[PDB]
Design a protein around this ligand. Structure first.
Ligand SMILES: Nc1nc2c(ncn2[C@@H]2O[C@H](COP(=O)(O)OP(=O)(O)O)[C@@H](O)[C@H]2O)c(=O)[nH]1
Ligand SMILES: [Cl-]
Ligand SMILES: [Mg+2]
Ligand SMILES: [Mg+2]
Length: 295
């Protein structure tokens, strides 16, 4: 999955194979290689340092210095350390009879695409989604979600220019009651950078609509920095979970591996292609396996 990191890790481990017992010196050399692989993958410096302290402690706790096949102990502890950095176990959204979600984040992060993906995901699970196109600034934004809605077979309500947050609410709540739409997915405005006025508008919108979940959508190819906006969003709006997009173009994985530490939020979904089908519920253990070469 994260080819640069994946190859560096597997290499550092494969270097130990078939050489018998290792000394403490050998073990420290491998931990350094692991640390550099994480630093070059743009992993948060604190996450990387904790990762390797955890690999050390765990591997010594399994008597790696007495193992005749220490590569296998290192492989297992690296797996476990990847899993826990990614969040340990899956924490997926629990839906109720009526649900309203926001997708928030910077322009270009994958919000509109992710909205349509979620509508498709849940449509197939028996839900009746409604996309709400509430981004009025982005050129053709409403037409874009309108078209994606046609593609996935899901209705799209478009907010009008200047519409107030209470008018949006009434119109969305009306459309969802009349048509029995039990998952409302709201695609929101966003710029290339944190914009304070616009954050104010978003906060006001959140207060009025009262979403059950607020998904912060993050382009995984910007690495660590993708995560710099997380506190800003959370302090103003109240983020409940993350979507990490464009993992299919991400060679490093720094944002994914750093997300839990930096943001304290669970990863809900991964975006793995530009198609509406390109959406995976997020399981730390699957990605952990994938990074070390599984599948
Ligand atoms: N390859 C890939 N492309 C994606 C993914 N998610 C979104 N995109 C693409 O990223 C770009 C931005 O998508 P968009 O939904 O408009 O982002 P937005 O400005 O935050 O709404 C578009 O070219 C999408 O096709 C993903 O998981 N993988
Ligand atoms: Cl060295
Ligand atoms: Mg958009
Ligand atoms: Mg909730």
């Amino acid at each position: 999955m994260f080819q640069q990191l994946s190859a560096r890790l597997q290499e550092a481990i494969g270097r130990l194979r078939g050489r018998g017992r290792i000394t403490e010196e050998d073990l420290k050399a491998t931990l350094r290689e692991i640390r550099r692989a994480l630093m070059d993958a743009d992993v948060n410096l604190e996450v990387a340092r904790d990762f390797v302290e955890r690999v050390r402690e765990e591997a010594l706790g399994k008597q790696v210095l007495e193992s005749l096949t220490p590569a296998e102990v290192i492989l297992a502890t690296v797996y476990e350390a990847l899993k826990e950095a990614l969040g340990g176990e899956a924490r997926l959204p629990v839906l109720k009879d009526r649900n309203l979600w926001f997708l928030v984040g910077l322009q270009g992060s994958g919000k509109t695409t992710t909205a349509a993906k979620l509508a498709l995901y849940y449509k197939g699970k028996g839900r009746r989604p409604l996309l709400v196109a509430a981004d009025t600034q982005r050129p053709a934004a409403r037409e874009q979600l309108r078209l994606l809605g046609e593609k996935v077979g899901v209705p799209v309500l478009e907010v009008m220019d200047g519409e107030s947050p209470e008018s949006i609410r009434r119109r969305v709540e009306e459309k969802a009651r009349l048509e029995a739409r039990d998952l409302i997915l709201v695609d929101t405005a966003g710029r290339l950078q944190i914009d304070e006025p616009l954050m104010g508008e978003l906060a006001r919108l959140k207060e009025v609509l009262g979403p059950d979940e607020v998904l912060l959508v993050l382009d995984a190819m910007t690495g660590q920095e993708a995560l710099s906006v997380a506190r800003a969003f959370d302090e103003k709006v109240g983020v409940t979970g993350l979507v990490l997009t464009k993992l299919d173009g991400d060679a490093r994985g720094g944002a994914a591996l750093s997300a839990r530490h930096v943001t304290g939020k669970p990863i809900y979904f991964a975006g793995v292609s530009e198609k509406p089908e390109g959406l995976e519920p997020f399981y730390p253990e699957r990605l952990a396996g994938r990074i070390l070469g599984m599948g």
